[PDB]
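Re: beginner question about structure tokens

> Can someone show what the tokenized structure looks like for a real chain? I only ever see the sequence side.

Sure, here's an example I had lying around. Input first:
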Amino acid sequence: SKTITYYNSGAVPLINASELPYDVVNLAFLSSSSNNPFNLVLSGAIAATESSFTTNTIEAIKVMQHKGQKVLISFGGGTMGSNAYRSLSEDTAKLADSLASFVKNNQLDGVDIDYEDTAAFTGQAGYDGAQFLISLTQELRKRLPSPDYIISHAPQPPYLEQGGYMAGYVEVVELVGQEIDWLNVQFYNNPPWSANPDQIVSSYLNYTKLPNMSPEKVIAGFPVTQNDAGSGYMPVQTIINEVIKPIQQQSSLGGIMNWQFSSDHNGDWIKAIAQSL
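And the corresponding structure tokens:
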């Protein structure tokens, strides 16, 4: 199983992650400028400017990588507009080249596609979101081959519900799941999954059985603290004993993701979770 975290807030120095039991750190975020959607800009504690990492970030990445940890840039995030994606969907190869260049020029291990434009799975966004994610994944994987590079996505549970109205990622995994390393499923901000372990477990198992998916390719994601999500916080003892152990009893568990690194005091959360894996 793998342990994954997102780094957006800088309240805890990034280099602290190099001494904690994380396998993957997603730097959040790279996203479209309001100006021109094909110009990608950085946000969060990683950014010295819109186009550059801070000095401390650059060093922390090297130290993490020396430890055998993988560091991805997360593209997207919750604040990226559907209108920017609509434009990008008309030239995914150009977007892929920009992302691949950012990964290579900053010596990263790949990309996390944190895509949250739900309306593009319901016919309300003026572009086909599933075909966008399918094409973007193919073009990115062309430029960032396995197994040297990682491509993850971060879907929300409705995206993966067979037969659902917003199940865009069912189509995604059916067409290009073999090219995706794993899914960081956000079991938060999404009723009725939020803080509902029984529903999280049954859905997790269903997702591992989608075409091209497996336990290894599905990571269960949670907020560290109450302030990390509008809904879905659960104490770590509940995650362990009502999510992790029930999944381990029936299948295997690809891993645990959290939002977000700087909310975890002294790394206690990841230490307890890791232990349980």
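Each token stands for a local structural state, so reading them left to right follows the chain. The radius of gyration is 17 Å.
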